[PDB]
């Protein structure tokens, strides 16, 4: 199974450059072509490591470069002049081999590299309780949650009761605030008869900032 | 230079249904046309290439057809794992362009949301800010409207909302909306309310609290 292993997530300021890496695993480059596709899906360009030739989309003229190390079976794309709208997941993808047919397709994909372009620096979230009350009950069931506010960059992981609570949990996609910082919420519906007897704790991990918070959510 | 257009943008269907998705190219591209499937958090995966050839391992319920400018992908007996996003892509000429995607969602009967409201926490108020959260839980269809009111005055530009993907347990959606004010503005008002409009509600529902 020929697979593609990609380099880790990147956070870049506007006007800088980023180099994404893609390593062929379970196989070599051989005669194949490898492209980068970001995410709507958009092809940026690709490289033929065998001959050290690259193609590019005109949209990225003067902004994109490619390289490959045949010894390590690693290919690279450098994207320069970064803009906030370059924020995307960048997939490396192998083309099917044209020796069999020119009507090619992307037959192997990497897992993607998240590239965040922003003037913000890494910041851990504040975690606030969404307390259950009579305004969060619907007859036998109560709602509670945690507001995970003002962090950068993505992602954050939220668990409830260290994983002991999974049913009824909704963790929402983050929104990007006008401040350039992210915010999300995680909620759970529980039996309202459990509020005085069961402890509810939201566990929040923001690896980019080494932030780990456990917040008890109590009624008041 | 070649625009790819897909229709419909979103399709609701049931397990076992037969559906046909369409892709159109702005220029003739012979049969240099590929279909990919993508589920949230995962890279796309090819299903059909050269307009009608099935990639090894792809269930035979998938088929493709077309040559020139009009192309179709048919799923004859949708299975749960087929509820995904589908992209077409031309390999005829650079730049190699993708369609915008068709998302398949699961049908269910209309479900009204349960509405909950959360005042700001004491810990956030101490920091000088106030966020109020309104939760719409387990509703269908996805279309829903939330309107923030502060002492019955309609708010705009100070809130954001997020909607979950379709829940695999019950095929519903959930929505969270956050209204954020400074502590100073928050303490000048009393009644905070979110009003919710949805097909399952005969009339809009308001959840509120007094500061």
């Amino acid at each position: 199974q020929v697979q593609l292993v990609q380099s880790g997530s990147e956070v870049k300021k506007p006007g800088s450059s980023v180099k994404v890496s893609c390593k062929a695993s379970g196989g070599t480059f051989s005669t194949y072509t490898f492209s980068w596709v970001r995410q709507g899906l958009e092809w940026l360009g690709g490289i033929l490591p065998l001959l050290n030739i690259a193609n590019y989309a005109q949209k990225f003229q003067g902004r994109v470069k490619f390289a490959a190390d045949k010894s390590t079976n690693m290919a690279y794309m450098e994207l320069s002049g970064l803009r906030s709208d370059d924020t995307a997941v960048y997939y490396c993808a192998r083309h099917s081999n044209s020796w069999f047919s020119p009507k090619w397709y992307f037959d192997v994909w990497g897992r993607g590299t998240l590239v965040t372009v922003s003037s913000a620096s890494t910041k851990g979230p504040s975690v606030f309780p969404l307390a259950p009350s009579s305004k969060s009950t619907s007859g036998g069931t109560a709602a509670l949650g945690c507001l995970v506010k003002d962090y950068f960059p993505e992602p954050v992981t939220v668990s409830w009761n260290s994983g002991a609570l999974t049913s009824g949990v909704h963790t929402f996609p983050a929104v990007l605030q006008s401040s350039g910082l992210y915010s999300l919420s995680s909620v759970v519906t529980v039996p309202s008869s459990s509020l005085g007897t069961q402890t509810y704790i939201c566990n929040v991990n923001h690896k980019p900032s080494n932030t780990k918070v456990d917040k008890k959510v109590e009624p008041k | 230079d070649i625009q790819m257009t897909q229709s419909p943008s979103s399709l609701s269907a049931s397990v076992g249904d037969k559906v046909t998705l369409t892709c159109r190219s702005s220029q003739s591209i012979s049969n240099y046309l590929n279909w990919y499937q993508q589920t949230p958090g995962k890279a796309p995966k090819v299903l059909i290439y050269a307009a009608s050839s099935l990639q090894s391992g792809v269930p035979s319920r998938f088929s493709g057809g077309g040559s020139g400018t009009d192309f179709t992908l048919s799923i004859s007996g949708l299975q749960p794992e087929d509820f995904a996003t589908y992209f077409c892509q031309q390999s005829y000429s650079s730049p190699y362009t993708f369609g915008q995607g068709t998302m398949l969602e699961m049908k269910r009967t209309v479900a009204a949301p349960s509405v909950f409201i959360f005042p700001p926490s004491d810990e956030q108020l101490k920091s000088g800010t106030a966020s109020v959260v309104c939760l719409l839980n387990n509703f269908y269809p996805r279309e829903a409207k939330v309107q923030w009111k502060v002492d019955n005055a309609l708010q705009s530009g100070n809130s954001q909302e997020s909607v979950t993907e379709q829940d695999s347990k019950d095929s519903t959606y959930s929505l969270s909306s956050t209204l954020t004010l400074s502590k100073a503005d928050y303490e000048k008002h009393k009644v905070y309310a979110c009003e919710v409009t949805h097909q399952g509600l005969s009339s809009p529902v308001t959840k509120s609290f007094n500061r």
């Binding site: 050290n52 030739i53 690259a54 590019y56 044209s98 047919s101 | -």
Partner: peptide, 19 residues
């Protein structure tokens, strides 16, 4: 990076052309 950026050389179909 330093591969030759030659859009006139179709890297997606060259093997088919060269047979």
């Amino acid at each position: 990076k330093w591969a030759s950026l030659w859009n006139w050389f179709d890297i997606t179909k060259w093997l088919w052309y060269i047979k």
